[PDB]
């Protein structure tokens, strides 16, 4: 029963809790929990990246899970809009997330 959740954390400890089912879509989470496991035990503290950015980055992972569950491409899956303002920092969050 491996937690069922991992914690991607933003700025001053704003913790987004991501279901294992989504988490595993990031090989990076899967590595981190196993490598420096004394530390990153389903915890990724990007304690500098902002919650509204991290939210979109992890929402992509959830969206990916939904898309996968859907399987047949689109069953009311919305357009994954990313405002320009997001992209700037979201790039780094996305890189760390590294699907």
């Amino acid at each position: 029963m491996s937690q069922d959740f991992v914690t991607l954390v933003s700025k001053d400890d704003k913790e987004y809790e991501i279901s294992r089912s989504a988490a595993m879509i990031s090989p990076t989470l899967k590595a981190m929990i196993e490598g420096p496991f004394r530390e990153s035990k389903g915890r990724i503290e990007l304690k500098q990246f902002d919650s509204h950015i991290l939210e979109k980055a992890v929402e992509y992972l959830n969206y990916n899970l939904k898309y996968s569950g859907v399987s047949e491409d689109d069953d009311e899956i919305p357009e994954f809009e990313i405002p320009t303002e997001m992209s700037l920092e979201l790039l780094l969050a996305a890189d760390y997330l590294s699907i």
Binding site: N64, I82, P83, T84, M86, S87, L90, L91, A94, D95
Partner: peptide, 15 residues
């Protein structure tokens, strides 16, 4: 995917 979207947005912004 996310990277591609982000890159496309950045590219669009720069263009």
């Amino acid at each position: 995917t996310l990277k591609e979207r982000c890159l496309q947005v950045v590219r669009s912004l720069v263009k």
